[PDB]
Design an enzyme around this catalytic site. Structure first.
Site, PDB file in Angstrom:
ATOM      1  CB  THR B  12      -0.788   0.106   1.072  1.00 15.62           C
ATOM      2  OG1 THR B  12       0.012   0.170   2.328  1.00 15.62           O
ATOM      3  CG2 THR B  12      -1.872  -1.194   1.423  1.00 15.62           C
ATOM      4  CE1 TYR B  14       4.683   8.890  -4.147  1.00 15.46           C
ATOM      5  CE2 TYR B  14       6.649   8.075  -4.723  1.00 15.46           C
ATOM      6  CZ  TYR B  14       5.553   9.011  -4.982  1.00 15.46           C
ATOM      7  OH  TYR B  14       5.840   9.679  -6.003  1.00 15.46           O
ATOM      8  CG  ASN B  37      -2.943  -0.221  12.757  1.00  6.11           C
ATOM      9  OD1 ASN B  37      -2.221  -1.081  12.212  1.00  6.11           O
ATOM     10  ND2 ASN B  37      -2.176   1.186  13.142  1.00  6.11           N
ATOM     11  CE  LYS B 128      16.666   0.930   2.221  1.00  7.34           C
ATOM     12  NZ  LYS B 128      16.088   1.765   1.086  1.00  7.34           N
TER      13      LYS B 128
HETATM   14  N1  LIG Z   1      14.639   6.257  -4.978  1.00  5.05           N
HETATM   15  C1  LIG Z   1      13.687   7.129  -4.223  1.00  5.05           C
HETATM   16  O1  LIG Z   1      13.763   8.370  -4.799  1.00  5.05           O
HETATM   17  C2  LIG Z   1      13.002   6.877  -3.194  1.00  5.05           C
HETATM   18  C3  LIG Z   1      11.987   7.483  -2.850  1.00  5.05           C
HETATM   19  C4  LIG Z   1      11.180   7.124  -1.535  1.00  5.05           C
HETATM   20  C5  LIG Z   1      11.484   5.988  -0.953  1.00  5.05           C
HETATM   21  N2  LIG Z   1      12.271   5.128  -1.399  1.00  5.05           N
HETATM   22  C6  LIG Z   1      12.486   3.835  -0.826  1.00  5.05           C
HETATM   23  O2  LIG Z   1      11.560   2.824  -1.292  1.00  5.05           O
HETATM   24  C7  LIG Z   1      11.089   2.096  -0.293  1.00  5.05           C
HETATM   25  C8  LIG Z   1       9.939   2.074   0.358  1.00  5.05           C
HETATM   26  O3  LIG Z   1       9.438   3.522   0.659  1.00  5.05           O
HETATM   27  P1  LIG Z   1       7.950   4.155   0.629  1.00  5.05           P
HETATM   28  O4  LIG Z   1       8.310   5.707   0.543  1.00  5.05           O
HETATM   29  O5  LIG Z   1       7.398   3.548  -0.557  1.00  5.05           O
HETATM   30  O6  LIG Z   1       7.335   3.593   1.772  1.00  5.05           O
HETATM   31  P2  LIG Z   1       5.729   3.963   2.362  1.00  5.05           P
HETATM   32  O7  LIG Z   1       4.931   4.229   1.490  1.00  5.05           O
HETATM   33  O8  LIG Z   1       6.144   5.134   3.470  1.00  5.05           O
HETATM   34  O9  LIG Z   1       5.667   2.783   3.308  1.00  5.05           O
HETATM   35  C9  LIG Z   1       5.623   1.402   2.759  1.00  5.05           C
HETATM   36  C10 LIG Z   1       4.225   0.841   3.599  1.00  5.05           C
HETATM   37  O10 LIG Z   1       5.048   0.179   5.111  1.00  5.05           O
HETATM   38  C11 LIG Z   1       3.761   0.030   5.954  1.00  5.05           C
HETATM   39  N3  LIG Z   1       4.192   0.470   7.164  1.00  5.05           N
HETATM   40  C12 LIG Z   1       4.218   1.719   7.635  1.00  5.05           C
HETATM   41  N4  LIG Z   1       4.587   1.781   8.996  1.00  5.05           N
HETATM   42  C13 LIG Z   1       4.730   0.389   9.468  1.00  5.05           C
HETATM   43  C14 LIG Z   1       5.115  -0.185  10.447  1.00  5.05           C
HETATM   44  N5  LIG Z   1       5.356   0.474  11.713  1.00  5.05           N
HETATM   45  N6  LIG Z   1       4.988  -1.512  10.575  1.00  5.05           N
HETATM   46  C15 LIG Z   1       4.827  -2.127   9.501  1.00  5.05           C
HETATM   47  N7  LIG Z   1       4.386  -2.037   8.355  1.00  5.05           N
HETATM   48  C16 LIG Z   1       4.372  -0.517   8.284  1.00  5.05           C
HETATM   49  C17 LIG Z   1       2.523   0.594   5.191  1.00  5.05           C
HETATM   50  O11 LIG Z   1       1.751  -0.437   4.858  1.00  5.05           O
HETATM   51  P3  LIG Z   1       0.219  -0.520   5.510  1.00  5.05           P
HETATM   52  O12 LIG Z   1      -0.293   0.439   6.164  1.00  5.05           O
HETATM   53  O13 LIG Z   1      -0.528  -1.540   4.514  1.00  5.05           O
HETATM   54  O14 LIG Z   1       0.847  -1.662   6.729  1.00  5.05           O
HETATM   55  C18 LIG Z   1       3.203   1.287   4.029  1.00  5.05           C
HETATM   56  O15 LIG Z   1       2.104   1.594   3.285  1.00  5.05           O
HETATM   57  C19 LIG Z   1      12.321   2.239   0.970  1.00  5.05           C
HETATM   58  O16 LIG Z   1      13.389   1.299   0.943  1.00  5.05           O
HETATM   59  C20 LIG Z   1      12.691   3.829   0.593  1.00  5.05           C
HETATM   60  O17 LIG Z   1      13.976   3.877   0.957  1.00  5.05           O
HETATM   61  C21 LIG Z   1      13.221   5.441  -2.399  1.00  5.05           C
HETATM   62  C1  LIG Z   2      15.527  14.345  -0.396  1.00  7.96           C
HETATM   63  C2  LIG Z   2      14.182  13.946  -0.272  1.00  7.96           C
HETATM   64  O1  LIG Z   2      14.055  12.506  -0.377  1.00  7.96           O
HETATM   65  C3  LIG Z   2      14.720  11.793   0.599  1.00  7.96           C
HETATM   66  O2  LIG Z   2      15.049  12.021   1.618  1.00  7.96           O
HETATM   67  C4  LIG Z   2      14.888  10.518   0.312  1.00  7.96           C
HETATM   68  C5  LIG Z   2      13.623   9.602  -0.200  1.00  7.96           C
HETATM   69  C6  LIG Z   2      14.721   9.694  -1.033  1.00  7.96           C
HETATM   70  C7  LIG Z   2      15.445   8.617  -1.331  1.00  7.96           C
HETATM   71  C8  LIG Z   2      15.566   7.638  -0.277  1.00  7.96           C
HETATM   72  C9  LIG Z   2      16.593   6.428  -0.376  1.00  7.96           C
HETATM   73  C10 LIG Z   2      17.133   6.269  -1.712  1.00  7.96           C
HETATM   74  O3  LIG Z   2      18.021   5.253  -1.638  1.00  7.96           O
HETATM   75  C11 LIG Z   2      17.297   7.301  -2.647  1.00  7.96           C
HETATM   76  O4  LIG Z   2      18.080   7.303  -3.884  1.00  7.96           O
HETATM   77  C12 LIG Z   2      17.352   7.607  -5.045  1.00  7.96           C
HETATM   78  C13 LIG Z   2      16.347   8.595  -2.569  1.00  7.96           C
END
Ligand SMILES: NC(=O)c1ccc[n+]([C@@H]2O[C@H](COP(=O)([O-])OP(=O)(O)OC[C@H]3O[C@@H](n4cnc5c(N)ncnc54)[C@H](OP(=O)(O)O)[C@@H]3O)[C@@H](O)[C@H]2O)c1
Ligand SMILES: CCOC(=O)[C@H]1C[C@@H]1c1ccc(O)c(OC)c1
Ligand SMILES: NC(=O)c1ccc[n+]([C@@H]2O[C@H](COP(=O)([O-])OP(=O)(O)OC[C@H]3O[C@@H](n4cnc5c(N)ncnc54)[C@H](OP(=O)(O)O)[C@@H]3O)[C@@H](O)[C@H]2O)c1
Ligand SMILES: CCOC(=O)[C@H]1C[C@@H]1c1ccc(O)c(OC)c1
EC number: 1.1.1.318
Lengths: 310, 310
Positions: B12, B14, B37, B128
């Site tokens: 669910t 992002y 929840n 990680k």
């Molecule tokens: N490359 C980039 O630009 C970039 C940007 C953003 C994120 N990231 C990476 O992408 C990955 C996912 O990030 P995201 O932003 O997609 O995650 P997110 O939407 O913040 O969280 C993913 C899911 O985690 C569950 N969750 C939240 N709190 C929890 C808890 N306390 N215990 C258990 N489950 C919980 C929730 O699902 P439910 O409500 O269904 O339980 C939530 O929808 C990470 O590894 C992040 O570092 C990378």
């Molecule tokens: C500057 C605003 O965004 C962030 O702080 C974190 C969510 C962005 C992020 C999180 C984890 C990553 O490996 C990554 O690489 C592209 C990017």
């Protein structure tokens, strides 16, 4: 019986929920306006079990607002920053209905009419001033509430009690004084003054003598309470100022507010005016939770941290 | 039929929601683990209408996880930063079940095994790496996905298209190169590689040649698209570095990441290794949405901004 009927906008909000609970505790019929798509479903059920009347709708529904206004006596707005000028929709309804006995706009912080801040924050408080000027121009009965710092919010923000770190960040020298009050009390007192003739068309400030402190003093008292010492890391004022000019919005807003509150000491940089009302002197049967009591609460049953909307 | 059954944690989320949708679009039986929840109720209803099997539970329910693992073939974790080490609960269940054919941990960003960052960010990517080392130690089949920058996320973050301001903030000189990919594509490609033997026990990097750009170039192309010129305000690198040392957590994390991505140019600072797999070269029937196509999307139907959890 004779109890005034109270309508609260943003009642499901961070501070708004304490106003709703305070209103019901005081026996006031309480109306809570909330968006149809609000996620505050569990909080709304709580309000309902406590006796509140839930009204779903949007601020854009002028007719709905007018008809609602006709059923109440007091209107309190606890809307957030992004909705400051949207309060003109609430004001227009009040003007049309014509029966409102008191309106409290969404201030609940610094006293915007006697302090200035860096551009990011000044822009926002100027919007709050606009609402005030409109209220006065229309001769609408009012009460302006300067609640100063929300205590749980800022104890969480400054001390980060849910963080086992060995260092603590201090903004500026840390010598600037500020006043902070417990949210639950801010909510109760706000309902009290909203009907108190002594607060009619006046500015009310929440500044109990037991809730004035500096960042350095707060840290010292927390250290004594928990038996741990922290390494203090300071963020120079010139550093904070530069950031407000380079960083994008909304990022630069919290920074400007930190300068205002903890460097300029805006909540404690002025003396009371002749017509000012300090709320702690109003009710002998009540009192504001003190800083010591607040720190005890964070030791025994700490509230979760929060972040305002920008 | 003979389609691999896929279990997604954080579905669910992002980026997780795009993996769930991609899985279903590709005809894979799809299981979505979600907290009882969770507020993602409407999104869950959407998944359900698309054919997903919703499983409510907590990561602490070891027995439930083991029994669930026995019914699937592939496991993908899209959990957030705060839950990185909680993935060890997922890994323990995978180890006990013993039937999993591929596990993709929650990377989806920089390639942590070949780059280093400032302390606030280094601490997170080290967690990680810990998950990765454990997977390898246990001989669990895997695929490590370096998706580089989430495009909608960062176009919103860098250009603030929903803001009518005349200035734009640039981090550092703005000449550092970076790669960004559309979330919907990241989601689809992730499902594809999860069953593709060519990605078995390998690092897969998403770096289509049409999605490499600098901050200055992105601004210039956006200006041409919308016919407006912006004043560029730079935030000096030394300034960004200083903040990561003085600001508290989690505030200093985004700052450290900005330095890593847009100053150090971590997504484009290395050359491919012998065993690396660049995803855009894998499927002649697919392609990543380009930067120009992305800018067009932001003109015609821009997605809302988002902020990761820290
Ligand atoms: N490359 C980039 O630009 C970039 C940007 C953003 C994120 N990231 C990476 O992408 C990955 C996912 O990030 P995201 O932003 O997609 O995650 P997110 O939407 O913040 O969280 C993913 C899911 O985690 C569950 N969750 C939240 N709190 C929890 C808890 N306390 N215990 C258990 N489950 C919980 C929730 O699902 P439910 O409500 O269904 O339980 C939530 O929808 C990470 O590894 C992040 O570092 C990378
Ligand atoms: C500057 C605003 O965004 C962030 O702080 C974190 C969510 C962005 C992020 C999180 C984890 C990553 O490996 C990554 O690489 C592209 C990017
Ligand atoms: N003194 C301090 O330390 C301090 C700290 C924080 C805030 N403040 C002040 O306290 C006041 C309230 O702040 P807050 O943090 O309590 O507010 P909040 O919780 O962010 O928001 C209050 C309510 O606004 C409603 N709302 C949200 N988005 C809306 C939209 N787009 N249109 C219409 N209604 C919307 C929501 O209610 P529904 O979901 O029910 O519609 C929400 O619960 C402000 O004036 C703020 O500046 C002061
Ligand atoms: C620094 C983190 O908090 C804030 O940015 C805003 C929510 C805090 C606030 C908002 C408005 C105010 O008037 C005020 O004065 C006490 C405080």
């Amino acid at each position: 019986g004779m109890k005034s009927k109270i309508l609260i906008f943003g009642g499901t909000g961070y501070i708004g929920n304490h106003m709703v609970k305070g209103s019901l505790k005081l026996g006031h019929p309480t109306y809570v306006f909330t968006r149809p798509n609000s996620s505050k479903t569990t909080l709304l059920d709580e309000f309902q079990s406590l006796g509140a009347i839930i009204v779903k709708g949007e601020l854009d529904e002028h007719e709905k607002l007018v008809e609602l206004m006709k059923k109440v006596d007091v209107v309190i707005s606890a809307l957030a920053f992004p909705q400051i000028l949207d309060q003109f929709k609430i004001l227009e309804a009040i003007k049309v209905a014509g029966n409102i006995k008191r309106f409290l706009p969404s201030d609940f912080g610094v006293e915007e009419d006697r302090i200035n801040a860096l551009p990011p924050f000044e822009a926002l408080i100027e919007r709050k001033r606009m609402i005030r000027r409109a209220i006065e121009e229309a001769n609408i009965p009012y009460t302006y509430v300067s609640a100063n710092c929300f205590a749980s919010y800022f104890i969480n923000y400054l001390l980060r009690p849910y963080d086992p770190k060995d260092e603590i960040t201090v903004y500026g020298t840390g010598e600037a004084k500020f006043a902070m009050n417990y949210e639950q009390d801010i909510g109760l007192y706000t309902i009290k003054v909203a009907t108190d003739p002594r607060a009619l068309n006046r500015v009310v400030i929440y500044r109990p003598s037991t809730n004035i402190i500096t960042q350095l003093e707060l840290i010292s008292r927390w250290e004594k309470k928990i038996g741990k010492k922290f390494k203090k890391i300071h963020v120079p004022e010139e550093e904070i100022v530069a950031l407000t000019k380079e960083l994008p919005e909304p990022e630069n807003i919290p920074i400007a507010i930190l300068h205002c509150l903890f460097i300029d000491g805006a909540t404690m940089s002025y003396d009371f005016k002749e017509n000012d009302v300090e709320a702690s002197t109003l009710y002998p049967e009540l009192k504001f939770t003190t800083i010591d009591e607040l720190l005890d609460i964070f030791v025994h049953d700490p509230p979760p941290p929060a972040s305002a909307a920008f």
